[PDB]
Design a protein around this ligand. Structure first.
Ligand SMILES: O=C(O)CCCc1c[nH]c2ccccc12
Ligand SMILES: O=C(O)CCCc1c[nH]c2ccccc12
Ligand SMILES: [Ca+2]
Ligand SMILES: [Ca+2]
Ligand SMILES: [Ca+2]
Ligand SMILES: [Ca+2]
Ligand SMILES: [Cl-]
Ligand SMILES: [Cl-]
Ligand SMILES: [Cl-]
Ligand SMILES: [Cl-]
Ligand SMILES: [Mn+2]
Ligand SMILES: [Mn+2]
Ligand SMILES: [Mn+2]
Ligand SMILES: [Mn+2]
Lengths: 232, 237, 237, 232
């Protein structure tokens, strides 16, 4: 299967597959069952920002999600990603809906990777284009004329569809670690707008790092967030 | 045919096709016959650096090539690249040899492109830096004779196991991702590129040179573009 | 007297001292009488963005000012700033009012300077960004009437507690550290600057404008430089 | 007194004031007695590189020192620097000699600080100037025409002086934390050349963060590294 490291913004508690009983942010290391989670108050219709940070020295993957009123949730997990990820990867954003739904709109996304022994890759999207040639769109993900990336399906009356899954990966492979590097670090930021009129929103948005040839696993809508073939 | 904007470091004067009679740097807009050149002293076996700069406000494409002893050459050309380039491009490095030959070794390469707009840090950007190349450089598209090695360099043209450059060689490296080089709503579109290189020859004369280029995304080496055509153009027109 | 290079966003036409008869952006080299101007439509109460670009290879100082509806003005001037500026400078923002007045509110300001040389990433650089200013902005030198506030903005000229701008006001903000704007061994010296601004007036006419400037490190507001002199120059010469 | 957070490259073991018995890198939080150390093989006459990394999310101050042959030492310490440092600071490099000596030559220094809620400061010195107007030199520190920063005294026959102490601080104050920031991060890199013909080199080099008005404490040569008035 694919190899997956992901930071999940989990809006729907599936407390039978390891979720806590409450919306959360979690650090996923090769399993949808987060190694680490923190309670997250999602603010319906508000623009949130997620920051993800890691370096090979501290060996701590950290993430924080916040809203303009200052409320925020943070989670960190100690892990040496040299022993998890392949040397070359692709980086992306993933989202899904299931029986409940939400918009999974990305307003911006930036990523930086550095190997210092410097080699580096940095991209910033503050506005997306209709035909975004440096993005690989998988599943239901589209870019529009409003400058945003819709990861899951939306009807032309701006209503989110259910049972939807979509991804956006940066076109170029990324050299995420190299043995001779004294420092391998990466950081990513994205802003998002999750809006729902359901009685509960679902299922969430994730930033993920995968094998270069990663594709949406069969049957990964809903609680699997377009990342994992199963809940193991 | 491809669309090509390029900065050439031209080591061999082909005066029959518009070259000045002396090694030179030039700005190539859709033709190997540079719109603008400057005399260039290539220092055999020394590591040189080339810097390339452009922005949509000044609409002046500039380049300077320098060596550690301080000598440098510069060329600038006024051009609105919105009227030349496709909206999406690939960026790359190209080099060739012909009847004369040289190593066309790249030791490092960086590139930045930015689109800035109406408010600020409504910004799209792409930046990459290679200060060491790896054997399997997955974010580079190698064409023709170009290879990357475990010595950390990019050899654009063929070299023998004994380090000797070969003639009638052509090769290029393109960054893997397409680049959004202009966009109509942006107020500023800028790019900049730097590479360092080691051109060394024992021939009666070095040839043919190295170029930084920007092309349509599906650009490939034109057939027969060794020698004076630098792997960029199908003819000397 | 100070040495001043500036990009002016000039809201009030002082045709008696060389202004065109219409609001404009201009490039000021040691004089308030711009070497180059372009007609500029200031949009009262809208947030505008100014971008300023220069590098030592093209030796073209460029600037563009734009608003959210898409309208923009641009000006460029060919000049070798090595022959104008001291090796070390301070960079800043300046604004003034006179018989007419306007808010001269800065919402954000960024600046990058780079010296690149013989090999590569033998690079010296300075980069700062303010997207929010604080009450006690310790890395800014405020002169004249300039203040920073808890609304996150920099008010270059005086405003009343009821939000109303005042006349006969002048103020500036300089980044605290000196900047090494050129160095003889560098092959490339570049700088770039961006700021966003909100100019709003209820007067019969707004005046006088905002400038991005580069000065000697010990530059101070010239006496009597309110109004048409924009806090930059001691006279209209 | 001053407030000091520092990463020390400690070439001389003062095992009576807390040093381990062997050259080390350590994380100093308001005391020369490092909260955390790691054994460090200093390579006489070789150019080393030090990287220092921190962010307010993971709350882990990390540092790594390496040489071109790949040998390296790393240390990390969990600390929330919002509770240690004043909001505004100056950042600098410090070095000293005592009864034993070494050159304390800085070949380059870069620093980046960001507040994301972005405000940012970044400077890079890959070559120093004779009159470096954006550096505050304290004590014996000088910049030369060879492009380097000599933190401690050197005779005109390139021999390092003893009982020497000097510092270089960046001219502008740095806004190192702000309450509303979702992410406050900083990173610093410097390259250095420590060379000695003594029978033991001493005393070391540190990257430090201080109150804006920090100055060399009286009697901080030797084992105090120009940072602390005493060994408490
Ligand atoms: O542009 C990026 O993606 C990096 C900066 C993140 C960012 C840019 N603008 C913001 C407004 C609110 C919260 C976060 C941000
Ligand atoms: O230039 C800086 O200070 C940041 C990069 C650090 C760095 C630049 N060149 C190197 C060679 C060896 C080891 C580290 C480096
Ligand atoms: Ca869930
Ligand atoms: Ca030729
Ligand atoms: Ca005027
Ligand atoms: Ca010691
Ligand atoms: Cl399952
Ligand atoms: Cl031909
Ligand atoms: Cl006058
Ligand atoms: Cl003591
Ligand atoms: Mn979950
Ligand atoms: Mn030519
Ligand atoms: Mn004017
Ligand atoms: Mn110690």
């Amino acid at each position: 299967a694919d190899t997956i490291v992901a930071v999940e913004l989990d809006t729907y508690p599936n407390t039978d597959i390891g979720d806590p009983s409450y919306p959360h942010i979690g650090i996923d290391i090769k399993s949808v069952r987060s190694k680490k989670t923190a309670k997250w108050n999602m603010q319906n219709g508000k623009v949130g920002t997620a920051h993800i940070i890691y370096n090979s020295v501290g060996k701590r993957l950290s993430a924080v999600v916040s809203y303009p009123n200052g409320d925020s949730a943070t989670v960190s997990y100690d892990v040496d990603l040299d022993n998890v990820l392949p040397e070359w990867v692709r980086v992306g954003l993933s989202a899904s809906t299931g029986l409940y739904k939400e918009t999974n709109t990305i307003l911006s996304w930036s990523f930086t990777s550095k190997l210092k022994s410097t080699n580096a890759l940095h991209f910033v999207f503050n506005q997306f284009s209709k035909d975004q040639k440096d993005l690989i769109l998988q599943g239901d993900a589209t870019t529009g004329t409003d400058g945003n990336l819709e990861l899951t399906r939306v009807s032309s009356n701006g209503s989110p569809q259910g049972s939807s899954v979509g991804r956006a990966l940066f076109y170029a492979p990324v050299h995420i670690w190299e043995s001779s590097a004294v420092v391998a670090s990466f950081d990513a930021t994205f802003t998002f707008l999750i809006k729902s009129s359901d009685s509960h929103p679902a299922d969430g948005i994730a930033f993920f790092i995968s094998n270069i040839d990663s594709s949406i696993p069969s049957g990964s809508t809903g609680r699997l967030l377009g990342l994992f073939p199963d809940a193991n």
